[model samples]
Target: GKIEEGKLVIWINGDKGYNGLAEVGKKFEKDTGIKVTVEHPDKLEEKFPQVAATGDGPDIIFWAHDRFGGYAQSGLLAEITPDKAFQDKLYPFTWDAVRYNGKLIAYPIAVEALSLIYNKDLLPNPPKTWEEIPALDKELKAKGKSALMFNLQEPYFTWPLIAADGGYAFKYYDIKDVGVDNAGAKAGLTFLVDLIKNKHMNADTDYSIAEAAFNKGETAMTINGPWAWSNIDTSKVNYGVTVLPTFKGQPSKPFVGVLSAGINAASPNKELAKEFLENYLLTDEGLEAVNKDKPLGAVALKSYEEELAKDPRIAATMENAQKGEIMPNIPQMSAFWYAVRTAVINAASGRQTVDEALKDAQTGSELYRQSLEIISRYLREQATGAADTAPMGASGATSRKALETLRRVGDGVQRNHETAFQGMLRKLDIKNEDDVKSLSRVMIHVFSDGVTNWGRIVTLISFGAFVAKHLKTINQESCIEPLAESITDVLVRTKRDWLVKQRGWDGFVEFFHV
Candidate 1:
């Protein structure tokens, strides 16, 4: 086998279709005489994790822009910056989406954004603003046509409307001044809910039904991407694409989805992989394949010529790209999606008002933040050699000690009694009965679980707490007062740090009188 013809494995999302890379692979082999091999997982969700965890996955993959954020943060993605070949060819925005914190992570092939697709026969002119959309809906209904066809399941697909109304799913890094709970986001949510509840859109519509209706000129309009253009039966249908409508003058921004190529971080031939991608994937030859077979937008490489003269949607897509936000790559984004989509649905169905739904989404996000706090605290303790401070309860404290002791000793009987005793004495000032019971329950748990080893630690802790109480009484100092002082100190320090250090104290102080 030729050196350049070595195996080049790839994985593609089953939902996006497998043939996305087939043409490229064929062309690569034909041009360079390098045979490229590809493999697609049946269940991408299950397979990607297993492969990424093992660091033994494909050389290339076709994944969504939404997932790029998460994979980049995890250090699972490869860096392409050191390779000049890749850096020179890609378009700036397309390259930027796959790059996280200056490390180029993937090779981009295409960009997609949602637009308002209407039946030209039914809607001679699509709504240009949120106010006008309702009128168009009424007109369509009066003429015996469905106003719009959309799937409630696809939240990103409908997000262009929210963007037009100045709504966003998550705060971008650029808008630190505008918090998530601000009025702009609320207004956006209100618009989405109002549209859905008023029957201007249908949650029951499937992608197939939407496409069928558009092809037969049944539904007046739909929110979709350029991929639908390839699927739409344009034989007798007169359909056109336009930028999504807005409430104010704010442009309807759509998420820019980038399909990029990347070198596998753990690849045996990483340099070769980088060279192949830069020379073949980001060039005119590669981009032409993308424009002909897949969805099209601004090519990452500057060499692709002006080919959008006849395509009406290209202008709107470019307009969208100018205002487009790259979807968040943060690990928390996956969790955020669930909360946002669920809350939006509830609001849309009139089960909750937009404000209530957004509040619910924010609350749900806080729960995720709480979960992250525990994991982050654990990692921080591991890194800083600090003791694990379990949430405010005696049982949590005792359990922490028990677990720490277990880590130290192989046998249950070999527990470190002194450390356990000290930890318990420190925790006994917990005034709540629930806290005391929680501590006691953990002692019982250790007794049952560790048997002989559990006894010395638990007994020692109890004795230390008893001695501390007596010592406090003798000194005539309330033990709880010191604990309260410690807690107060932490809160004060936290407020000062976040307000003064993290968020800049000058602005914070100016916002409210202390």
Candidate 2:
């Protein structure tokens, strides 16, 4: 069998970037005698994996870096190790994104990250810091305009505020440590709450509303990425782009994401795919074709990125990407979006304090964990022949007891966890080491979302104490270990960073003695 002399296939999402690439594909065909066929699918992300699994997909696929992990894990992506010379030409962060579990899994294409897009007619200059926002808002409001607007209900747009104060969905490259309930996060949420309460912004504004407001001149500035640029009528709006303003002197670091191309592991033409991506697609001529309409966030190639920098709008996006954190590609990140979104919405709507909102987010995660405990117990009971052979609802006595205990301890654990959490929240100064330690304990019991440490002794001890006190009339020993083990299993698996905090570890161990 020999390679086809003039044949390659690529699947691209139907975006302007991809639409522009069809011309580049023709150029690649003319130069190399390789006929490159590019297809634009309506739902490439969802459909590509399915098609690839059947070995009938295109040789190459272009998409965001976030989905790289799941595809790599499922053995659907071809590992690509670029030559050292070629690798040297890329941005470090772009290169880092294509790597999954320390293996290069995608071809870095372009970077997409958020920045401030403002109307020059409304504000001559962008505000340098968030502290200046209130005055700006007041001035805009006097003129029947809004100073700033963004998709407040979406976590993606709101993350910069959270990150400016040192909050993050996950610690960089560390999948297990969730930093959502920390002081930095609380500070960020508090700022957002004040902004909403003061009528400077609305918490209900979604992407369409926010973007439309800015485009219609109802708002002076908006926090959005490059994708929205095409929809704006620059002739009327007279807009300017800049990196997100600092908050309390700290930079607003949005999550930087890349649109990348990856070879299908199942494709027979992987080498051809590599040659097309590395040699043809990454070239200046190739990138120029893709970015002709508008520079698609900074091009990943260092040389072309310099060219894109000449455009101030493109440069602003590059500046933000350089300062921003790379969006996590791990599958665990799926849990972060909704939990953080709910927390932000809750705080901004005045339904909960910043601390309480985050606490509820953690509790929501715990409730999911409790469901797993019941299922695990059911399986264990069935295996030991201590349960009926019937379905879960028709289970044996042991299975029934296990379900009953799970519900009881689940309710009790939540109540106790909340009591401890509220006690910790009462103190305003999280700067104190003792207060932080207390907060860590409360977070542990609540099984704070993204925390990998599963076995927080304090949480288990507190739940165990509750079980002992409440179930004293029954076989307490039998009931206690199942609930304790279930919660402990999760704590050990999650491995929260707080477990290693100074004095935190010692305090956790000493709790048993006290």
Candidate 3:
């Protein structure tokens, strides 16, 4: 394969764009004498999508693994499996993200993850599991100082507690496959709730403000990823990076994202594009764009380990990546993000018991899965022209038919109304984290909505909504609003009286969600 000279074009995003792919483009051009023009756009999302949608994008562009799935599924990315010889030279884990249905869509350039970044000036050693945090907190509390630094508002950082407890967000078809329903996943959620309730960690700190607090030597330990490493500034305080600790045998498995170079499917110079990718782009010289930025770690196939050994942060990130999970690229991942974070926040804020929060989430996920399965089955049957609907209860009379139609219409109308109501709530901004917890407390009516007082449902919902709306007026995305509303609704709508009716059932374990 041979590259087309003067026709090749490369595009990158922003000020760091030059240090990123431009440098590699220069090396690539110098080696092959192929003119490669690089452009740094002000708005990457707007520009990249326009170029891609119009079939006029650059021959090569820098992209993240998370967005690869949508692009590949829509036929926007090139299938690079034919270039396997060159692809084989990359790290196994790096290649994990680009493969979809056995097709390779991109080549990895760099890998990243979170590290247990700590202040060496205070905590010469960092704890591995959350259980160890309290002793350190006690020490700091004795001195009237904050024990740790972290943004509890951000779920990504808090999620590691679940991993440490051996829980995951999803399951796989194989042993290596993972999902959200397993015991490990439950344990993970439980641990995070305990961390918050025990007051070992603070979700109240503003991230930007907390960084200033950490730099000023106000906090001892914090967990952060590579993007924040530059801000630690050893000039301000002594710090070190280490792999996050385990809960039981499982350690904190941070999500690792692989950065890769994507070839545009619309490129007219496909052959030259392939040649540029195989010979120069995936080569040692081609990887300089990512490698030359020393603190960021190396993408070079031959020297990745050598580079990791020299940079402690990079080394920890690599180690964390090995123990971490690849963020799922499935289209459903976004919804999962909202659902999982909601569950975590509910459990964390003491708005609901750990089991109550996760059980509801797991149940909701299963319900959605079943709904999809039923819809798919119906669609398949219709495609084969077998039947429009499954045979109803056997009687097949006019009254039965009429009753079923009414049920169907009623359910559909209820769902539509709920959606519209949720939309209205969104407009009022009452469903976010900041306001949700307090709303949830009032909504759940932990004191009033229990089995002894199920009649208080209306009062709970009204009070919860009013409080949540007030909170939303000042701040948005607080968990309290929905928490309060849902708890009241579930109690009012369900007949799960058996749990409460059981002999000797206490309020703590029974009616915990209320």
TM-score of each: 0.67, 0.64, 0.61
Per-residue alpha-carbon lDDT of model 1 for 1-514, expressed as tens digits?
Answer: 1112256777775434346456777777787676777566876644664576457777666665567655655456677664555466556667667767766677776677777888888888887776777777787788888767766665676566566655665556622122233476677767766777788776565567777777777788887776666555444677788877766777777777776666555666566566566666666766666556545555556567356434667777766666768776555565456556766677777777777766655544433333223223332343334645556232233234333443333123224355654566576654442343344334443443432322343243334234334444455224423322222222222232232221222222233322
Candidate maximizing TM-score? 1
Show how many residue pairs clash in every candidate, following the order shown: 12, 12, 33
Off-target runs (Cα >4 Å) in candidate 1 are 1-5, 14-20, 30-47, 169-182, 233-236, 269-272, 349-353, 364-514
Model 1 superposed RMSD (Cα):
12.9
Off by over 4 Å in 2: 1-16, 29-59, 233-236, 345-357, 360-514
**Model 3 C-alpha lDDT per residue in residues 1-514, reported as the tens digit of each score:** 2223357777654423345455666666787777777776766534765567557767776655766665665456788754555655777767877787677787776676777878887888788766677777888878766667676665567667666656665554221233454677778767666666677665466467667777778788777766565556744688888988787767788876666667778876666667766666566555554444433444536454454557767778878878887766553344344456666676777776777666555443332222222232222322332433553322223223332332343334434455554554555444455444333333333444345542233233333334343444555424442344344334422423322232111221233222
Better of 1 and 3 by TM-score: 1
Writing each residue's lDDT as its tens digit, candidate 2 over 103-210 gives 999988988989999999988898988878988999888899989999988788888888888887656644434567778878887888898888888889998899
Ranking by TM-score: 1, 2, 3
- List the global CA lDDT of all models: 0.57, 0.69, 0.57
